[PDB]
Amino acid sequence: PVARSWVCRKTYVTPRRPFEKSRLDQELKLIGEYGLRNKREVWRVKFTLAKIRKAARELLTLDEKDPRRLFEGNALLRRLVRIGVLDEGKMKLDYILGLKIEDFLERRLQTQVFKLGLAKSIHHARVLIRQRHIRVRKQVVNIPSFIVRLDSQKHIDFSLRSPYGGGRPGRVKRKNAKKGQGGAG
Amino acid sequence: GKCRGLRTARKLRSHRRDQKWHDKQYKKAHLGTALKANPFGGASHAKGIVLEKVGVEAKQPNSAIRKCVRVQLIKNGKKITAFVPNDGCLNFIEENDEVLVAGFGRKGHAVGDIPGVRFKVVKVANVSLLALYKGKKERPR
Amino acid sequence: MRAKWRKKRMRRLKRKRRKMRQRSK
Amino acid sequence: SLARVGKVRGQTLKVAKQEKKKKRTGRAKRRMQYNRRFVNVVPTFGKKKGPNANS
Amino acid sequence: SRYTHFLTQHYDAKPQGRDDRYCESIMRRRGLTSPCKDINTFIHGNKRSIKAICENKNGNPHRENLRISKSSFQVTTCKLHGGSPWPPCQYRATAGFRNVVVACENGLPVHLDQSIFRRP
RNA sequence: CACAUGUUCC
RNA sequence: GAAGACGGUCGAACUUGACUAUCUAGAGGAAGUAAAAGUCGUAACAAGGUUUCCGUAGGUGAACCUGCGGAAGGAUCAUUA
RNA sequence: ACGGGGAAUCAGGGUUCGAUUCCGGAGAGGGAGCCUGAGAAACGGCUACCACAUCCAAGGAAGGCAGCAGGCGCGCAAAUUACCCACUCCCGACCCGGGGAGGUAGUGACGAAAAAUAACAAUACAGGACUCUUUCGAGGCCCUGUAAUUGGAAUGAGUCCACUUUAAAUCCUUUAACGAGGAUCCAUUGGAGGGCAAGUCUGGUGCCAGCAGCCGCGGUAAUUCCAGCUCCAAUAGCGUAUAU
């Protein structure tokens, strides 16, 4: 009897067919356009879409006016609008089925760095996450898979400790300066 | 089903309990006699002592001399014709050396080209046969 | 091979496997 | 006979594996792949060339 | 090992066919056509009389270690024709009733040199 | 009235 | 109030005997399957040269043969007042 | 074959697993018998027989890791003879004493969550929208890509202190110093005949060695063996075996 978790859930699902051309192209279009690191996080985002879509599908099988459908329906639509996936103008349980895989792909923080125009590239955008160069609500985030909500969209900016922001200049400038005055006397 | 009574669940249970025995893949695992003729005994691998290197000839026009090994089991005492997997690896395996034999993959059936063999060697003397063929690990003499 | 004499050979050999057994028992 | 073991592997003439520039790993391996699958291809009539095709 | 090598390269019980095809079919049934061997001979009959060649029972002596058969048998000499010693091998037959010139060792034939006629 | 058999890398 | 004894009880274990389970030696006999392209002869597939087949008996190197009763999966769905 | 909650798989239905931290049962070599106590047929309590086994002065005496570690053996198969009662709690006459229950580290590609192995610009070059030109070409108001080409800019592996963390630590996070241009600080594992994404590349091999789960390839111009080059899938994982 030792107190620990032992709770594991795999966040992804490998596809049934591993070697078909059709599925191979679509995910390649999703990696290159959104700057992903493997094919796993493609199905990982496709797995959490399969969780929400199934949770939406069984609610339709429960008939209307049911409080469980009324509560868990409105509880699910509460979170979809708070993270910038579904607009206020389409708040209904029928719309979750028409929600597609690229829709969550906007709400990755890495896209928001190439959306707000503070990155030269979407692939340069991930490095600004990796080098602790940007912060959200006075909190630096070293992980690109942070799912930004609709509320902090205007709070995305450079970190406080960053040469590309309001912080100390980096090591390359501190190295190109020591020979900039050490070579001049 | 064929008998569709309201309280015929016993007759419907006995048949899928009786006729289940006529299933070939079922009767192999739910009767230990197959586990008797199994040299391993439900194991993924087995260790044994090599005593000779046999040459077993092919059958079909894909005819060649397959380089096999007659291994003697060191947990039950059986004698098994293993198979040296890779090309020109019969020189790596030496005589009276412990080997890790395994199933071939078809699980108890002669696998095409080689007759009457279900078993291949993966390790010798705690050294893999991939590493020897790749030369990354050698036999310490 | 006919399925008729292959039954017959399996009947003369069957009567042998009993007749060599009864005297031993 | 078991004297012919390793016949070809000894007599296959060696080729020194020549030095070549290492490929960029990680997501950049997919960044370069995505390039030469969508953004650089021109509409060219004729049969589609294989990724290793040479005749 | 040397004895059965003779019975593969030089012996065949009943020669079904005797023609050019039969020479071209017996020679790849034994493994003699890789590469196609230039010429070869095959004896017919029973083995005890072939075994009788090592002594004076049905054998006279001939140069160093060779022996002529006293009574003759049937032989088949198949000549490879074509400047490629690689298959497909093309042979032409010759029927006949000739003697044998074998070089037997330990009582067992291993090498048959020539198939001759008796005397002119 | 009788008439059995086959050699096959391609 | 101890040692001890008498009786009673639960009762391990041991000798012996029976029953049962599993695995294993066996001269020899008898099958099976596979490796070759061996010997013998054609049984089947065309009316496969005596149509094939089923049950049952007896025989014969081997296929198989024959008797008796079937059957078409037969070479006739039919041949005449 | 310890049962159950349950786990793995799944459209629906089920199939299989559940020695394994929760409850309960059962037992501390094998069985039998008991003492004491509210509560035991108790075994880190006794008394026998049976097996194994320790020291002797040979008269005797003593033993029970299916407790924490650890050792052999068995094996295809499994960690350190570590630190501490601070947390969790329990026990006692008890604020204090004690607890290998437990907690903390160590080994640890069982396994799960996250996540590096680069980013940009200029030029030389291929190319796409415009106008002139019936083409050639062109500037590029606008790009796309490549090229041991050049150029700085930015980081963390790691060295490293300090605090922090904690019972004391370690690691995580924090702070100073250094710290990459072929960022040589260099990502593999399987395949490239079909099934199945991916050369009719090149040489060696010649029904040989071998490959391949299946079909099938090798008999001298091998799209299947062996090498190199290139290419394909997955990516710190992947193949293989066996179970379902």
What single string gives the DSSP state of each residue in chain D? --TTTTHHHHHS--------PPPP-THHHHHHHHIIIIIS-----SPPPPTT---
How far apart CA E104 and CA C16 sit, in angstroms, is 49
Instruction: Give the tokens for residue A143.
Output: 């992980």
D28 CA to F5 C1' in angstroms comes to 74
Mark residues 5-34 of chain E whose C-beta is closer than 7 A to nucleic acid strand G: 13-14, 29
Q: What is the resolution of this structure in A?
A: 3.7
For residue A127, the SS3 value is helix
Alpha carbon of residue A151 to chain centroid: 15
Q: Nearest residue (Cα to C1') for H239? A: B130
Alpha carbon of residue B116 to chain centroid: 10
User: Do chains B and C touch by CB distance (3+ pairs < 8 Å)?
Assistant: no
CB atoms closer than 10 angstroms to residue B48: 26
A6 C-beta less than 7 Å away from strand H: yes
CA-nearest of A151, A164, A29 to A83 is A151
- Tell me if B67 and D2 make a contact (CB, 8 A cut-off): yes
Instruction: Give the tokens for residue E75.
Output: 């032989």
Look up E10 and say whether it is catalytic: yes
Q: Residues of E annotated in the binding site, as ranges?
A: 18-19, 78, 100
Report whether E110 contacts E3 (CB < 8 A). yes
CA-nearest of E102, E97, E99 to E63 is E102
Look up E81 and say whether it is catalytic: no
- Tell me if D5 and B67 make a contact (CB, 8 A cut-off): yes
Sequence-ordered list of residues with C-beta below 8 angstroms from that of E9, at least 6 positions apart, any chain: E30, E32, E40
DSSP assignments along A55-73, one per residue: HHHHHHHSPTT-HHHHHHH
How far apart CA E117 and CA E120 sit, in angstroms, is 8
User: Which experimental method was this entry solved with?
Assistant: cryo-EM
- Tell me if D5 and B65 make a contact (CB, 8 A cut-off): no
Report whether B65 contacts B55 (CB < 8 A). yes
Instruction: Give the tokens for residue A183.
Output: 């070579």
Search chain A and give the residue with CA nearest D35: A32
Phi-psi region of E14 (alpha: psi -120 to 50; beta: other; left: phi over 0): beta
Q: How distant is the Cα of D7 from the closest Cα of chain B, in angstroms?
A: 7
Strand G nucleotides within 7 Å of a protein CB: 23, 29-31, 34-40, 43, 52-56, 59, 63-65
DSSP assignments along B29-77, one per residue: HSSHHHHHH-SSSS-SEEEEEEEE--EEE-SSSS--EEEEEEEEESSS-
Residue E100 Cα distances to A55, E39, E53, E75, angstroms: 94, 15, 9, 8
D32–A contact, CB cutoff 8 A: no
Q: For residue B68, list its beta bridge partners.
A: B83
- Tell me if A32 and D33 make a contact (CB, 8 A cut-off): yes
Q: How distant is the Cα of B107 from the closest Cα of chain D, in angstroms?
A: 28
Strand F nucleotides within 7 Å of a protein CB: 6-10
Domain boundaries, chain B: 1-141
CA-nearest of B91, B72, B93 to B81 is B72
How far apart CA E34 and CA E89 sit, in angstroms, is 9
How far apart CA A80 and CA A88 sit, in angstroms, is 10
